[PDB]
Each structure stands twice: as C-alpha cells, then as structure tokens.
Symmetry: D3
Subunit: 238 residues, 6 copies
C-alpha cells in the first residue's frame, strides 16, 4: 500500500519496535513474540506483528540513517495509524564513563543533518523523545534491575565523520552517544501527534577503540530488547 | 565577583529559581522564602537567598532574552557553584488546547537564535531540560493537584516576530508555548554538567486573543511558584 | 499599553535615551532632567520623562541583549511615536588603541545574532546608525572638547564568547568595541522611518563620573541639536 | 572486517554495481553473474561477487539515503580497494518528457543534504559523475540500442518532501530525476581517486501520475554491465 | 607588479576614484584631471593618474561585481599603498522618492554575497563607508549646492534578481539604491586601515552623462581635496 | 538592447566564446574570425561576430567573477537567443600534477558564491557543464592531438582567498583548477534550456607557486568543438 510497505491499515500493532539492521528485527520476532506474522518484506525490511504478554506489538527494520528512518516512520504514523515507535538500536559512546555493552535511553537527539531545518524554517528544532516513552523505558530498566543512562544523543549523517573535532565538543556538552536515526524520528512523531522513544546498546566507543567480541553484542542487545518490550507494555494505558 | 553580580561564592544556594521580571524575583523572595537576604542587586536584578521549608533556595531575575540569561546562568554555574536552575516564567501559548493561566513544563526548547549553532560547530543542539528536573516538576504538580502540561517550548529572539507563518508551523508540530530563555539555559547547564528546567504560566496566546481579563495572574503564578518551590526541595 | 510598558502614547518624549542598567537610567534622570517623572516601571525598567535645558527627553532601561532592546525599541517607535533613540551605554574595547574611559560613537554594528538575517531574507543587513545622529554626537563632542572615536561596533549575543578567535578578527578589521545591543536597534529605527544612534564609554578591554558624564553631556547636547 | 561488511580485501571485484534494494541486489547476482558467491550479508545487505562475460564484477545493496550509501561506498573504496562503483537504482522523474520505464544517466546530482557542505568548508561541492563512467554508460546504450537520457539528478534527504515548491524549481532548471544517493557517492569517489556513476530507471513521476521493471530494469542492467566491461580495461 | 596591474608602487595617487565602466574612467580623466597618464590597462581597465587642482588623483575601472572590485581594491591598498578609494558609480533606486539621476552617498552597503561572511566567521559584518569620506562627500555637496541623499545601499550579486520580493523588502527598511560593489569595497579598506566611500547617480528605478554625472564627479573631486588634508 | 549590450537580436551567432579579458576577445576576433564586425563595445566589453570555417561564431568579454558573467550570460541566452557559450579562460591549478600551459576542460564547477543557493532554495546546485559540450571539446582535442585534462573546477568569489586551508581541501578532492565564472554560467544555461561549457589554460599554480602556444591550443580546440555543434 506504500512503495516501502506491502501491508494494509491494521496489519501493524499500534506500537512498533524499530531497528536499523533488518536481521535484528527478524531475531526480535523469532525470539520474543508470540504468534509472529511477516507483514512487510519490501526491500528486505523484515516487519512482523505478534504479541508480547498478550498485547499487540510489531517489530521492523528502518535501515541506516535519517533519510531511511524518515520514510518508514512517516508511513507507519500516517498510513498504518501507529501510535508509538520505539527505536531499539546500537550507538557509539561519547562520555568516558559509558562503555561497550552499556545501555542508553535518549531524552533528545542533536544532529548535523539539514532535515529538521527544512521542516522548521531553517531554525533549531529540538528533536525530543516523548516524555512518556522515556519514563516507561526508565521504569522498565529499573524493574528489570538493568542500569540505564539517560541523556542526549547525536544523530550523525556521517558514520565516518571528517569533522574530527566534533566528538570532543559532544563530550564537553555531555552527549551520551552517537547513532544515525533519532533526530529524524522525534520530529516526525510530533508532526503526527504520536509518540517516539529510543533505547540503545553501546557497540563501540568513539573516543577510544574498545573490546566488543564476535557475539556479545547479543547479551546486552538482549537486555535492551527486554526493557523495550516491558516499556512497550506500560504504554498502552491509554 | 562578576560584572553582573556583587555576591561571593557561597552566597547562592545550590538551587536557584530565575525569572525574566526582577520584580517577580522580589515577590518570590518577599512571599515564599524564609529569612531571605538580598545578595545581588547589580542592575536591579534582585538576587536573594533564604530557605524554603528549611532548605537553601535562591531566586534572581535573568532579564529577557537568550543573551541575558546566558550571562547569568553561566556565571551562576561557573563562579557560584550552583547545581540546579529552574526558570519560573510566563509564556505565549501555541497549542490550541493550552489556554491562558495554564501551566507548562518544558522538556526542551527550540529556537531561532544562533547561539547554540555558535556553541556547536554549526549543527543542531537539542536544548534539553534535565530529565530529573522535569520529573521533579511533574511529581510536585501531581502532589499539589495542579494540572501541568509537558512538552516542547520555543525560545524566540523576536517577541514581535516578522515571520508570521511560524506560529502556525510551531502549532503543526505541537509546540506548547513560546518564551525567550530556555534554549540558552539548557546547554549551559550541560556545559557545567549541572541541571536545569523551565516551568511557565501562560500569559497570552499567539494564535488568537484569549483570557487576558482574568485575575490569575497571581493564582496561576502562585500555583507555578508552589510547584517550583516543591520541586526544588525534591532535588536536594 | 504594552506588555512591557504601562505608559500611554505621549508619556514619552520624541527623544529617548536608553541604557542597559535601569539603575543608571534613574541616576541619569535625576542628574540631568528637570522635573523627571516615572512613566513606566514594568519589569523594573525605570522609564522617566522630563526636560533637559527646556527640551523634552525621556530615559529608560533596555536590558542586556538584542532580543531585549528589540522589544523596547519597537514599542517606542511603534506605539509611543518616539522619533529618536540614542543608546548611552558601556562597551568592551577591541582596538589595541582604545582605552578604559574612552568615548566611542558607533557608525554601525556588526553581529553574531541571527535577528537581522531573519528580518532580511537571510542576507547581510548593515546595522547602521542614523547619519544625522552621528553628526549631532560628533559635533557635540567637538563643542564640548571631549575626545571621541568614530567607527564600527559589534553587538554580541555571547558575552562569554566561546569563539576565542573572534576578538583578534575584530581587531584585524578595526572594530572599535563590543556591546550587545546596537545591531538590534538600528534596523528597527530604519523600519519605522526613525532615528537611532549609540554612544559608549569603555569599561573594559577584551584584549589589552569623568567619562560617564562626558558621554551624557555629549548625548544630551546632540539631543538638543536634533530637536 | 568492517562493522557493515564481513568480507576481506579482495573479496570484492574492482567494479561494484550498487542498488537501494538488497533484494534487487540478490536478484542481479542470481540473474547476471556466473558463479555468484555471497561475500557479505551483514545487515541483510546481499553482497555478491561473480563474473560477467569473463571479467570480475560485484553487486551489493547500499540501503536508502545519503548517510547509508556514504558508509558503504567509503568502505568499498577504502578498505576493499574498489575502483569503480555504478549505482543502478530507480528514480522519480522531474522533466516533462521523461516517463516511467525510461532510463536516465546522471552527469551530476544536486542535494538538500548537508553532507557535502560538511566535507567542503560550507561551500558548494559539485557532486559530479566520473567523466569515464558517463561516456561508458552512454556508449553502451548506443551499442545496445537503448534510449537513455543524460543530465542532472537530485538526491533528496526527504522522500516525502515538505518543500512542495522544490519539484517545480527543479523542473525550471531541467533536473531529470530524483533519488536519494548519488550526491553522497560521487564526492567520495573523488576523495579516494576512484570513479563513480549512476544509472536509474523511472518508477514514478513526482510531478504527476511490477513487470517492467523486468524490461526497463532488464535494459538498465545490460547498459551497466556492458559499461563495466569497457571500464575494467 | 600585479596580475591585474602593470604599474609599480607610486604610479597611483593616494586617492583613487573608481567606477565600473572603463570607458567612463577615460572620460573622467580627460574631463577633470590635468596631465592624466595611462598607468594601467591590463584587461582594458583604463587606469589613469593626474592631478585635480594641483593635488594628485587616480581614476580606474573596477568592472562589475563584488569579486572584481575586491581584486582591484586589495591590490591598490596593499601593493600601491592607496589611502582612500571613492567609488563613483551609478545605481538603481529603491526608495519611492529617490528618482532618476538623483545623487546618493552611501553610509553602508547590504549584500546577498557570501564574501563578508567568508571574511568574518559567517557573522554579520557591517560594510560601512569611512566616516571621514562620508563627511567630505556631504560637505562638498552642500558647498556645491547639489542635493544628495544619504543612507544605506545594497550590493547585489544578481543584477537580474530571481528573488523578486527582495526589492520591496529593501524599500520597507529604507535602502536608498542598489549597486554591485560597495559591500566588497568597505571591509577591504578596514582590513588595510585605509578609507573608502561610495557616491552614486541614479540611472534607473527597480520599483517604478553631463548633468547628474558632472555633479557626482565634482562632489567626489571636491571631497577628494578635503581628504588628503588630514591626511 | 540591454544596459550592457548595444546590439539587437541577430548580431550574435548562436555560439559565443567568452573570456574575462576584453583584450583577449579582441585578440581572438582579429586572429581566428573572418569578417569580424564589432557588435557590442558598451563598457569596453569587446563583442565581435564573424565566421570560422564558414560558420557564425561570436566572441565577447564577460568581466571577472560570477556577478559579471551572470549578467552577460543571461542577456545572451535571453535577448540574443544564443544557444551555446564556451568560456575560454585562464585558471590557477590545484592538483599537484597539473602544470602551467596545461589545458583543463571542466565537467563542473564548485563555488564559494551564494548565487546558486539563492537560485535554488538554499540547497546544492551542481553547476555542471553541458554533456554535449564536454564531448565536443574532448573530441576536438583528440583530433588536434593536444592533451586535455578533464574534471572539476572551482569558481571563487575571492582571488585573494583568506581561507588559506581551502586550496589543500580542493586538492584532497582532486579539483583541477580555480577560476571565477563557470559556476555562474552553467545554471543559467540550464535555466534557458541552452548549453554551456568551459575550457582553460593554466596561468599560475596556487599550491606550489606564452601565454601564446598554449593559448593557441586552447583556441583551436574550442573553435573546433564549436563546429561540431
Ligand atoms: N560509531 C558510530 N557512529 C555513528 N553511529 C553508530 C552506531 C549506531 N548505529 C549503527 C549504524 C551504523 O553503523 C547506524 O544505524 C547507527 C553504532 N556505532 C556508531
Ligand atoms: N508571546 C510571547 N512571545 C515570546 N515570549 C513570551 C513570553 C515569555 N517571556 C515574557 C518576556 C517578553 O514578554 C520574555 O522574558 C519572554 C510570554 N509571552 C510571550
Ligand atoms: N566585554 C564586553 N562584552 C560585551 N558587552 C560589553 C559591554 C557593554 N554592555 C555591558 C552589558 C554586559 O556587561 C551588555 O548589555 C553590553 C561592556 N563590556 C562588554
Ligand atoms: N519519488 C522519489 N523520491 C526520492 N527517490 C525516488 C526513487 C529512487 N530510490 C527509491 C528509494 C525511495 O523509494 C530511494 O532509495 C531512492 C524513486 N522514486 C523516488
Ligand atoms: N538595477 C541595478 N541593479 C544593480 N546595480 C545597478 C547599478 C550600479 N552598477 C551598474 C552595473 C550593472 O549595470 C554594476 O557595475 C553596478 C545601476 N543600476 C543597477
Ligand atoms: N589564482 C587564481 N584564482 C582565481 N582565478 C584565477 C584565474 C582565472 N581567471 C583570471 C581572472 C583573475 O585573474 C578571473 O577571471 C579568473 C587564473 N588564476 C586564478
């Protein structure tokens, strides 16, 4: 029904977990959902709908980077009447106390893209996560006794950033981590009167080269997924 | 000890409430604080320190506009070793459902100022309220049975905005209200690894003319004031 | 009559002197104006109207910063029918040559604010002092034998400037001094077909009564000249 | 050996065709190459290496949008020593005489992204296709007798573009077609001394209104593949 | 000695009048200067040096546009050690009451060019005429009884302006007239601790060579005499 | 017919060669054109129209910098119904391999001007030479066995560039040369559904600091290209 989505109105739960890597979405469905149906596989994006603790949930990839999340998120919010998108991703740490495997929940997301300036008369849009979503995520992590840090992210357009000075600027202002998606997501939810959040697990540090193995990874990705899901259950009221 | 402040390190409590109107800072001090002391009156700014329910609090004006609050906020965080500034202000409603006398708590603030671009290599800084402060403010509002709305603010450099289409664009995106300070406060607190938040009472609507003829005013200021004072305690 | 001004049309004279410190404002009124009256104290801003050598003059605070002066200037030119604003302030010297207590007349003011670009389709607006005013101020100083430099100012949004290299660059281009207001004032005066100028006394160097009175005398004399 | 790419140096050929759709990637490998090995499937991206009419060729997805292609392309030119990339995607037509099924070769691409201004001191970078590639793409289209239009493209950050007056502005300036990638790619080619180009098939008109596709996309593919052969020598 | 100027240090006077039409520079030389000599004609730019009432003066073309004038102004002030440049051009009128062949003296110049942003860390540089020069032009006009308006100009990069709304905006803020040079000129003078100004005869109205041109030239030349005396 | 051009419609050929120096326009018309008539000398601009190998070709100065060429170019495409403009100029080399008296043909040109952002909703316009024209100039140079380099140029607003680090930046991206005109030219051509191109002779080097015989090579190529059109 869209160029990027073969599903119809109703095929998506009104809460969707989203991540960059479509194989992670497949994994989330195969691992945590009851009765998962493939609802969208246009461009291999792996969108599934099922339940978690009896409540309807959906999981899908959004591809890497703001332009990509901006396509999917808009479609979900407008065509498929989705109410909440929680991005579950990875990130690169900025703060010196945050390490690999750590978990981060974003209040907001800076960016170097021009997308919001196009949306917002060339002024400063504050890409902000839904207050609710943050709470839900913070409480889920507490209840699950998993430590989670709370603060600003940065959505870069350039994984390989030629501005080498930028990391330390972000560390001066106590940014927590870098990903490529959240600043595209937050204003879009605002635009549709809907809600959005972002929770991330740290995959590498950008201010030193760390130790990440070839599998773990998974163990901390698992916690993030668990928090996301419990939080998703709290949102649903109403 | 600064060009804008005749107090010495220690003269301010570690938590400070600020507002545009220095006469408002006077009122807060003369009304709510116990044993208040004038600690700074350079340029008639009205800086006071006392305690609230026995807890050290300070209050001071911050002028109108990002430049002004940027001077005072930085000085306070820097020289005076302040950990938390809550801005207690007024604002112009954007959202059709927020009405005069309603109380707004900001999660963050957008802006048309250039200050954060200057601070941040020409990129997009999200001026964000400190999560702890938003919580405290929301909790205190609940506790006191005062309805309070949570969301985005816009800090304008231009009260009389020659961009007439912008009011509606802000409304398209569900901005709650407009003031002139928060977008400059929030990053400064980050800089010093301190905390900041903004609570506001609605004094006008920028999308029609509404309830200016009302006497809250003080009954709505008072509510905001008490939410702010109570939140301040809860951050100590 | 405005959210920033309890006064009525006519409560202000056609000429207003403005400064950042409202405590300075009241001192000015008291020190120079016959029968001065408080005409606005919304936000402790201290606006007074009286006369000077028989001629009507107002004085009021404008707060620090472009957004603040923009509020007050527009209202005075708009609602209050003010014809001429002269900012009588302080400034941070830039030029290697300029010294603490020196008097500076701005011909224009550059800026790092975005306000002018928002007013002017994102192009470079030259915030220029009214030429008539610069004349009145320079002649005044000549007749009074007060030395006064004439040139560019820079209105900054960031008193504590994270751009540490900007001071040398302003020196390189012979900017005379830094304040935080003029660049906002001048474009507004043009907008209303009115006049504006700024005169400063140096208080500090960003690189390396006496003057206060001289500045006041200069401004007040110039105000007579522009009738 | 990169976080987006499990392959080692040499696993990719010197010439790499790229598209947005990693399923279209897979399909090209299966359809056009002999003995296609899968060399990278990190994030489902479908990187294949085989040969076509003898010479070595690779094919991989690049996701949608500048930030995505910038990741892959840099990695390809940098780690995997790739010499030539030809993007073989789709596009939204702008010009009034460009229709669905029609095939466009881009000389350059403009953009509303800020990427290039970040690379190029906040000035204007002309994201230009490599002169070789464009010739080759055109030469091939003549040889294979395929009608192909040459000119400017536009790479957008914003598929659902809130600036609705931009489409006509691009018509005014005779921009052929919109996609989301070339503006990112080309400057990177430049940066590593390498070469890039773009051929696209029209999937929609942005100024008005499943099987060709397998005719015009079929045609596009032949032009690209034949051009690749001319370039690897 | 420069890529755009065959002359050597000393060949130009400390005061130089510049216009954009090189054919005009030749006429000015003939019409006003005693013993004018060709000093530079790289690119047909018609550079001349003579005296006017016994005080040394030069006149050169500067071509149209900010990039051109920036080249010529920087060379004069650095290589040729010029102290004062006065642009004596034409301009299209903006203000409703400024009419064809009126005389405008610019206090400053707005611009749609990025040049001053590039020079000044992407902030607002106010391309301001040197106060002395402005004063010398004003006084001269009063001395000669020539009415002359005073206020801001705008230097465009786009003679044919695709931003059709821009003229009316400029009118809103009381810009007097448009040219294509002064915004380049002013900041360069400042860079070299020198002086610049611009005087303009209105040739057209964007909203709605012996008389006005003669008058502009006298004011520019009489002002050139006042400057030089201090210093 | 215009503030800068005295000629009427018909006076210019469909193809015009344009340079910065009017003394070169003059020297080109005298040398390569048969029966050159001076069609426009407003502001000393030196506009001629003749024939070459039996075909109408004009030649005119365009001044220095984008603002100037943007006036002339838009008048020629607009009032004079010109179809093709080939700029034949000088340029300072950027790439460490390119040298004095080399001949660069521009595919496209970057700029530090604001002119294209004004024209283009504050986005990035690729000032691209017309593909036909680049072919023609490339083909013509084979024929005459003259080495021609092909790629990106850069039009600066500032000959004396206070951005001292820019030169290397351009080298890091293998920009061949800097001039001051092509970035203005190309989008006007597009705007008028017309064609433009640009070819230069290298007069200086901006990173590691005749005329004639390289200028002849340049002139021959451009004229030869003009024929193929
Ligand atoms: N170093 C670094 N930079 C930017 N982003 C990330 C991320 C987060 N996501 C990974 C994907 C790109 O590798 C993109 O979706 C953001 C992990 N480490 C990162
Ligand atoms: N309409 C409108 N615009 C900008 N700001 C405000 C405010 C908040 N503050 C009041 C002061 C200006 O009136 C300034 O401190 C912002 C209330 N209504 C406003
Ligand atoms: N160093 C420095 N920077 C910016 N401005 C000033 C001023 C002028 N006014 C003083 C107020 C702040 O100290 C501000 O309104 C401008 C004096 N020294 C200054
Ligand atoms: N209308 C429109 N806009 C932007 N791009 C395209 C494309 C080309 N690609 C398809 C993907 C978006 O659907 C993106 O990778 C570019 C076809 N039609 C498009
Ligand atoms: N309408 C209009 N626009 C921009 N500039 C001018 C000028 C001033 N000079 C004329 C030259 C262009 O014709 C240029 O050098 C500036 C006169 N009328 C003008
Ligand atoms: N170093 C350098 N910078 C900018 N441009 C050029 C040119 C090319 N043209 C010569 C004229 C400036 O001297 C201008 O038309 C561009 C040769 N060398 C140049």
């Amino acid at each position: 029904a869209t160029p990027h989505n073969s599903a119809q109105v109703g095929d998506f739960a009104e809460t969707v977990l989203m991540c960059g890597d479509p194989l992670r979405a497949k994994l989330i469905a195969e691992t945590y959902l009851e009765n998962p149906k493939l609802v969208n596989n246009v461009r291999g994006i792996q969108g599934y709908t099922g339940t978690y603790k009896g409540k309807p949930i959906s999981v899908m990839g959004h591809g890497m980077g703001l332009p990509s999340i901006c396509i999917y998120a808009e479609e979900l919010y407008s065509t498929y009447k989705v109410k909440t998108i929680i991005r579950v991703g990875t990130c690169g740490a900025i703060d010196m106390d945050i390490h690999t495997r750590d978990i981060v929940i974003f209040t907001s997301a800076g960016t170097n893209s021009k997308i919001n300036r196009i949306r917002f008369m060339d002024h400063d849009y504050p890409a902000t996560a839904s207050f609710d979503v943050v709470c839900a995520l913070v409480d889920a992590a507490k209840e699950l006794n998993i430590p989670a840090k709370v603060g600003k992210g940065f959505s870069t357009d350039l994984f390989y950033n030629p501005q080498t000075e930028l990391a330390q600027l972000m560390n001066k202002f106590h940014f927590l981590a870098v990903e490529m998606e959240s600043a595209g997501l937050f204003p879009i939810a605002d635009l549709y009167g809907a809600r959005a959040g972002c929770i991330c697990t740290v995959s590498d540090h950008i201010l030193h080269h760390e130790e990440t193995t070839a599998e773990e990874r998974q163990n901390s990705f698992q916690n993030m997924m668990k928090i996301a899901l419990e939080a998703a259950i709290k949102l649903h009221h109403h």
